[PDB]
Amino acid sequence: ICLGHHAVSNGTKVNTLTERGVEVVNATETVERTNIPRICSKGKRTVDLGQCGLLGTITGPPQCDQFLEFSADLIIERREGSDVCYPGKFVNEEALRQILRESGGIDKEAMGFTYSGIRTNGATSACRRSGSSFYAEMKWLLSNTDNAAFPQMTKSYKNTRKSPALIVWGIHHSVSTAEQTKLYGSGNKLVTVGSSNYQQSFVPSPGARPQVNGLSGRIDFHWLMLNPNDTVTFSFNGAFIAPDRASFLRGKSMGIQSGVQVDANCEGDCYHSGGTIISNLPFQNIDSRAVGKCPRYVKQRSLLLATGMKNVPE
Amino acid sequence: ICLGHHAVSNGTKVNTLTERGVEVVNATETVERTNIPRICSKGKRTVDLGQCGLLGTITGPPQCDQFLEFSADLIIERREGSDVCYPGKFVNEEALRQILRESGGIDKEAMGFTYSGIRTNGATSACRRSGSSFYAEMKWLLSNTDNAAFPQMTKSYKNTRKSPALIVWGIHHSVSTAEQTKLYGSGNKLVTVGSSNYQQSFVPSPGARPQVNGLSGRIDFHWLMLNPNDTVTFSFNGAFIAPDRASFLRGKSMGIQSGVQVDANCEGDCYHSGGTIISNLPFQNIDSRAVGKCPRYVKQRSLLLATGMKNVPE
Amino acid sequence: ICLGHHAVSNGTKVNTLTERGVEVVNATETVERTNIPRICSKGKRTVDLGQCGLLGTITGPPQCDQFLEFSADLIIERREGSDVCYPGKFVNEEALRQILRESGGIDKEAMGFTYSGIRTNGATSACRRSGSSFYAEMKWLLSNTDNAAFPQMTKSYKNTRKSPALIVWGIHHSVSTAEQTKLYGSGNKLVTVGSSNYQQSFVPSPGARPQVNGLSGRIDFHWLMLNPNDTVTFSFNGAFIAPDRASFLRGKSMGIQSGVQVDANCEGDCYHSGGTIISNLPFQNIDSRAVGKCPRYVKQRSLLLATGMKNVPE
Amino acid sequence: GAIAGFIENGWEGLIDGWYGFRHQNAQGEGTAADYKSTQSAIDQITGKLNRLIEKTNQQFELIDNEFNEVEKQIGNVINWTRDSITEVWSYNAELLVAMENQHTIDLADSEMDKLYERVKRQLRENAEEDGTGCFEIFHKCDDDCMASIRNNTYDHSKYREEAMQN
Amino acid sequence: GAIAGFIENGWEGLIDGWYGFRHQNAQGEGTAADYKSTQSAIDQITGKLNRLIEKTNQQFELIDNEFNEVEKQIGNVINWTRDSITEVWSYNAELLVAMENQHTIDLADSEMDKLYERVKRQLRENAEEDGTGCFEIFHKCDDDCMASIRNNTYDHSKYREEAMQN
Amino acid sequence: GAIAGFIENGWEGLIDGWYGFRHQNAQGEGTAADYKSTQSAIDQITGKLNRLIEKTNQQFELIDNEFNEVEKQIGNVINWTRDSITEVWSYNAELLVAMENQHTIDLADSEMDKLYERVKRQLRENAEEDGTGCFEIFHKCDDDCMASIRNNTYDHSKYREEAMQN
Numbered sequence A, B, C: 001i002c003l004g005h006h007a008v009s010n011g012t013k014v015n016t017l018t019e020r021g022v023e024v025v026n027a028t029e030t031v032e033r034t035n036i037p038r039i040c041s042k043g044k045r046t047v048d049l050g051q052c053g054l055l056g057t058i059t060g061p062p063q064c065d066q067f068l069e070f071s072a073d074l075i076i077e078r079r080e081g082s083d084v085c086y087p088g089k090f091v092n093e094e095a096l097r098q099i100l101r102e103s104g105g106i107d108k109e110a111m112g113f114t115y116s117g118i119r120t121n122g123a124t125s126a127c128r129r130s131g132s133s134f135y136a137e138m139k140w141l142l143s144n145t146d147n148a149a150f151p152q153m154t155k156s157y158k159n160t161r162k163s164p165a166l167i168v169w170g171i172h173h174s175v176s177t178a179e180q181t182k183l184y185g186s187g188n189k190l191v192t193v194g195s196s197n198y199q200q201s202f203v204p205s206p207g208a209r210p211q212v213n214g215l216s217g218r219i220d221f222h223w224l225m226l227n228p229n230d231t232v233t234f235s236f237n238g239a240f241i242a243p244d245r246a247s248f249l250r251g252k253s254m255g256i257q258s259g260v261q262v263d264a265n266c267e268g269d270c271y272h273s274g275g276t277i278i279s280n281l282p283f284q285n286i287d288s289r290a291v292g293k294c295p296r297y298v299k300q301r302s303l304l305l306a307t308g309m310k311n312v313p314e
Numbered sequence D, E, F: 001g002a003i004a005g006f007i008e009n010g011w012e013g014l015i016d017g018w019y020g021f022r023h024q025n026a027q028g029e030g031t032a033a034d035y036k037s038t039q040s041a042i043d044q045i046t047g048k049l050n051r052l053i054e055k056t057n058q059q060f061e062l063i064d065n066e067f068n069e070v071e072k073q074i075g076n077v078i079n080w081t082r083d084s085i086t087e088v089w090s091y092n093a094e095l096l097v098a099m100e101n102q103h104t105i106d107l108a109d110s111e112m113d114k115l116y117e118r119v120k121r122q123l124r125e126n127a128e129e130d131g132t133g134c135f136e137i138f139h140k141c142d143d144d145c146m147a148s149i150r151n152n153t154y155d156h157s158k159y160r161e162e163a164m165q166n
């Protein structure tokens, strides 16, 4: 009586510690290459920011009117998104994004700032609503008349909640020194900001910038996290974009950047801009910057795992 | 004659390349879970900073009077520690901490700055000693009289030693523009600082901050490492907290943050805030931020290593 | 008939999963220790910067006259190299270096800035050519006469190319407030800079610095990458070192820092300051900061791989 | 051990299992399959897959921005780090599979040798090793006696007397 | 090889060593232990522990602050890095132990098979393989002859003549 | 399996190959070498070297500066990272070699055992196992009959009749 093992006509070459291209009876892939070109979001509270930039949700340009108090497990940023209406940018912008991506969304709260001896309804054609408007969560403070001076004001806000308060403000940089005085009067303008953890100061800087959205002026946005029971104080004399409301983080979420469509028919936990990596495999060769819960990125296209003996034909 | 192997009634399940929960005769743990809730410091020159903040050892608030020239192998920071008496903070504070944690302690040296045409004994109730005092290693320079002007002064210090000199100074931010002139006179105040490697400048910024230690003013601390034979120069006209002494690093040390007590009865090289990890094991699941010489942090609670054959009972 | 295996008198001890110092018939080294003390550059377009600092290639001090438009696969920085003639430094200097190290070299282009109502031929004895000169790619703009005022000027440059334009400018910090007015007149001097991606501002800061190259003044260099079709605008009123030409990256290269000589007789892809690591081995114990395409750095001096059976002598 | 060694090839006809018996006697030729040897090898390969097909519960998020680039210096540190980790995982992956494949092959070779030497001991001097994985019978076993070998009931004494003579 | 295969179970009575002999003859029943087989397996397991229980001389210090948080951007890069390294070591650890356990088991199985086949060759045709790890004697060995087997002195010829007949 | 076990030592005289035969008969003493066993072991060790002597195409560049130090905070994160990766590769390297060496040794031991048991089956009852890797002949083989064993042509029946008697 003779015994032996099974074999096939066409086996699969795999690699071993000692051989390259040794044929086995059966093998299975270990590196994921199959991408689904959609954001698989089944069962997740998803917010597609679209034209609203993430930072815009805090300040409130017209594109973000529907996102002022969003709530999500999954936040999607889009290339077409803008944080701004009146040309400007955020100092420490990427830190703030990473904070907001995992915030679970934001909850707004009035800071109760009232004013006397100035204006507060400053607007622009860069922020279109009914007509010329401004950042919905901000207030553009000028001097009362077409010139005049700006009273050295002092505003404070105490965080009365058990969560850190995201505070944001703006420094306005006029096109000219003339424009700066036409708005807030002449002289050295100074904005000072401090908490029980923060310590900084700001000065405007009028000058000609290139035109963006039709305007050659810029607004400098700044932010800080105000701890519970801690107070922030704004000392200013012009060129100051005041916060109207503060922001609080709702909970927990994951934020991605993507160009593909949302799909509530598929579930996924590993995302990249080109879609969702749905896989049980330990490794992937699709995108090294995939985020969420993913197989490890490896540079190899393929790595076959033997699921059978060495294939030895007649 | 029949031969065989040994076996036991109750074995230990372990994991293999092919099986999960296979029972072997004997096994041993590979991941450390046992923490000792004390800072094991036997045979080490230890400094428990207590209420003195690490950065405070350079400037000298009252809490750090006993630590102005400390010498250590092991430095312990405490939560109750403060770097400050008069409210303020350090620019690039964490870099300086990491430097000081491994400094082996500091050695102070007079910089020999003398003055003419100003005051130098500025104090405050935030720095309590005999009465109102100041930072022991610093000097609060005002104008001679309750108002008056501040002469455009120039002070230089050359590092005469073979080691880099830690230089530190302060910018005082008054509560009001009025307070700023009451101290150093009116006009634009400017502090410029440069070496053969450094290049920066500073301006005060008066304004109302919230009250800390009873005061609404702040002091901005700045620092630089002065190379051997290189000279640093201070150009100033007010709002300037001058260094009285420079600092030199003693040698080598390790710095930790902790809330547990020192114990000179046990020896350890792996520390975390909750104590000392004493172990021979290659891995640990106690604290991923443990520092010193430690087993690798792994996320698994337990990983049993077979020290015996497969256990096969009757 | 008896069978067996081969053996030798003197074997090689190696390590296994279970034994340390087990002798095998033959073994081979796995960790590279052999360094060649030259920069192996056979077949590579190499630029040895020598006394020219890398950042100097953009601004043009006399040491970099021969490197204003270099083209390379391999860039070598030298310790003796300086980016500067008139004492000063670059803000964000190391980022710019890393950019330039892989730039493949630079291509210059006139920005076409013309002037009226000022001077433009400012020089110094720190920049020696025919006599007192300046940075070849920069222009030192003063006021027309030995005093006088500086007209609030506005210069713009649009990047007309498909590649990002490296723009660089300088802020001059005079020795005294007197010197600052002697050059650009009295009053607050302001330089503002913006693009469709950039947003910043600059002010001079006169004061006494220590003497470098004989001078106590400093020039602050700043830079930005101007995207294709995007425009940068300079708003200034003095203390401004204007760019004459912009820079464009040629392609791709690798940059190293080294103290050893170039050798076109040997080929290498793994470099460090002490030479070239030529090896097929998977690991190396020569330099952990070796760059290029290298074996992995390991801390072990030696790790012998068995290439033969266990050696069992009589 | 055995495998592609003294067994020069495998049986493409054996489609009922991994390991099987092929006999020849008076009643003709037949081929079966050993379930317990096949299942043991299969369950072990299965054990590898369950352990390698694995899910991480560790979430990672963006520290990078592909719409608006982060500052170069921090950008370069990030890429440098990401690439370093890529090298490590690419290495781990390649080694893991190569190591696992070496063991899978040897394991399947082992299970064959374990089956063979068990049949050799299942009988006695009632048979001798041909050398190529075959067992020459010196008492002419029939299709019922063959089944006794397959389901492990062949008596190593109740054919001895006869087989000893031959 | 052998182990939980043709040896259906182990002896909970054998407390003197890992591997041992259990005989039966005219003088009764007895059980001993083989030192050289036990010690070889033990010394090898010991060799694994000494190599795994290992000390790093690489010191790491804080780049983080749990009293006063560092800036978010650098904070996020640090955590991202730390977590990545955690994943690597968690992986390394799990694989190491699983790999080491597989080899430890096979090694202990190997040392048994090495002992068995050495006894089988220590005699000759003076005995035959029962199949379950037992050796049937055809010359009735006594407690002195058994000791000759245990301490490796049994003569594969000075019992042959007698045993051949049976 | 075999190796430094029942073969107490190796032959420093065998310089023609890794494995060889050493016989003694009427015509004297001789020693040869088995090419197919030697080449199989050699080709496998070679396969390990080709896979380990490996080239990365991943380029890394400076994120550090040894002429002018980068800022301390980012400097410390870089060193912390570099050191962490160093620990990983130092670990990987040490484990790789130790793992590979264990397998190399066992592989060379295996190829010997595969050769031995193939000769044992190349004959029949025409020879018996001495125990120390030697085969005692009971039909006195000569230098031509020995070559028949070496180049694998020895007949396991055309010496049987004679050898059975002895």
Ligand SMILES: CC(=O)N[C@H]1[C@H](O[C@@H]2[C@@H](O)[C@H](O)O[C@H](CO)[C@@H]2O)O[C@H](CO)[C@@H](O[C@@H]2O[C@H](CO)[C@H](O)[C@H](O[C@]3(C(=O)O)C[C@H](O)[C@@H](NC(C)=O)[C@H]([C@H](O)[C@H](O)CO)O3)[C@H]2O)[C@@H]1O
Pocket: A121, A122, A123, A124, A125, A126, A132, A140, A142, A173, A174, A175, A179, A183, A211, A213, A214, A215, A217
């Ligand atoms: C079309 C254009 O380029 N012209 C802009 C002009 O530049 C001049 C050039 O046209 C000319 O060829 O060359 C000149 C030099 O030789 C100049 O460079 O500059 C003016 C301002 O000096 C620009 O006017 C702006 O036009 C905007 C539309 O594009 C808009 O109408 C601006 O009005 C606003 C605004 O809507 O935002 C009007 C607001 O009511 C007012 N709000 C408040 C609270 O003050 C704002 C506000 O003053 C600014 O936004 C703050 O900087 O002004 C108008 O400024 C022209 O675009």
Ligand SMILES: CC(=O)N[C@H]1[C@H](O[C@@H]2[C@@H](O)[C@H](O)O[C@H](CO)[C@@H]2O)O[C@H](CO)[C@@H](O[C@@H]2O[C@H](CO)[C@H](O)[C@H](O[C@]3(C(=O)O)C[C@H](O)[C@@H](NC(C)=O)[C@H]([C@H](O)[C@H](O)CO)O3)[C@H]2O)[C@@H]1O
Pocket: B121, B122, B123, B124, B125, B126, B132, B140, B142, B173, B174, B175, B179, B183, B211, B213, B214, B215, B217
């Ligand atoms: C108790 C309190 O809140 N009052 C502070 C006051 O704020 C006003 C409010 O009380 C009031 O309800 O509302 C007002 C507006 O409507 C104000 O907000 O502001 C004053 C100063 O303007 C504070 O006085 C300080 O009190 C300190 C004790 O808490 C202390 O007495 C300060 O004196 C010092 C000092 O000790 O540090 C006195 C020093 O001799 C002097 N040294 C030098 C070298 O000049 C310093 C120094 O001038 C400052 O530290 C620098 O900023 O002043 C006193 O300033 C009051 O707390």
Ligand SMILES: CC(=O)N[C@H]1[C@H](O[C@@H]2[C@@H](O)[C@H](O)O[C@H](CO)[C@@H]2O)O[C@H](CO)[C@@H](O[C@@H]2O[C@H](CO)[C@H](O)[C@H](O[C@]3(C(=O)O)C[C@H](O)[C@@H](NC(C)=O)[C@H]([C@H](O)[C@H](O)CO)O3)[C@H]2O)[C@@H]1O
Pocket: C121, C122, C123, C124, C125, C126, C132, C140, C142, C173, C174, C175, C179, C183, C211, C213, C214, C215, C217
């Ligand atoms: C040798 C030395 O230390 N003296 C420098 C002097 O400091 C004084 C000390 O000598 C004295 O012991 O103590 C005093 C206080 O009690 C002072 O500290 O300061 C003067 C300037 O105030 C320095 O003069 C410079 O000398 C340079 C040579 O080392 C050089 O001659 C400088 O002239 C330049 C230049 O060449 O760079 C001349 C240029 O034509 C001019 N170009 C333009 C476009 O303006 C520049 C330019 O003004 C500056 O470079 C900008 O800051 O000046 C001369 O300034 C002396 O070194």
Ligand SMILES: *[C@@H]1O[C@H](CO)[C@@H](O)[C@H](O)[C@H]1NC(C)=O
Pocket: A026, A027, A028, A307, D049
């Ligand atoms: C081939 O391998 C895969 C691995 O899971 C398995 O699912 C499949 O059934 C195998 N094919 C055969 C012939 O069994």
Ligand SMILES: *[C@@H]1O[C@H](CO)[C@@H](O)[C@H](O)[C@H]1NC(C)=O
Pocket: A228, A229
């Ligand atoms: C803030 O102040 C209120 C005063 O009633 C107190 O109840 C609350 O606990 C405080 N929060 C903290 C944590 O300081």
Ligand SMILES: *[C@@H]1O[C@H](CO)[C@@H](O)[C@H](O)[C@H]1NC(C)=O
Pocket: B026, B027, B028, B307, E049
């Ligand atoms: C169980 O394993 C550990 C591993 O070191 C060992 O110390 C202990 O002695 C073992 N127990 C027995 C039964 O030998």
Ligand SMILES: *[C@@H]1O[C@H](CO)[C@@H](O)[C@H](O)[C@H]1NC(C)=O
Pocket: B228, B229
């Ligand atoms: C500093 O200057 C003194 C002058 O005597 C010299 O001895 C010393 O070596 C110098 N140090 C360095 C390293 O420049």
Ligand SMILES: *[C@@H]1O[C@H](CO)[C@@H](O)[C@H](O)[C@H]1NC(C)=O
Pocket: C026, C027, C028, C307, F049
């Ligand atoms: C020893 O090992 C190396 C590994 O490549 C090999 O090149 C050399 O030929 C070996 N020496 C012998 C004796 O074969």
Ligand SMILES: *[C@@H]1O[C@H](CO)[C@@H](O)[C@H](O)[C@H]1NC(C)=O
Pocket: C228, C229
């Ligand atoms: C820049 O403008 C020119 C106008 O002709 C156009 O051809 C070119 O494509 C533009 N570049 C980009 C990418 O905007």
Ligand SMILES: *[C@@H]1O[C@H](CO)[C@@H](O)[C@H](O)[C@H]1NC(C)=O
Pocket: A288, A289, D072, D075, D076, D079
């Ligand atoms: C970082 O790596 C990505 C690819 O993952 C590359 O596209 C990008 O250019 C790199 N960032 C920098 C600073 O160049």
Ligand SMILES: *[C@@H]1O[C@H](CO)[C@@H](O)[C@H](O)[C@H]1NC(C)=O
Pocket: B288, B289, E072, E075, E076, E079
């Ligand atoms: C970094 O990780 C720690 C846990 O190790 C976590 O507590 C902390 O919140 C993280 N830092 C940031 C930036 O959130």
Ligand SMILES: *[C@@H]1O[C@H](CO)[C@@H](O)[C@H](O)[C@H]1NC(C)=O
Pocket: C288, C289, F072, F075, F076, F079
């Ligand atoms: C970083 O590590 C290098 C050695 O690789 C060391 O020389 C240097 O001092 C370290 N940098 C810092 C911040 O100390």
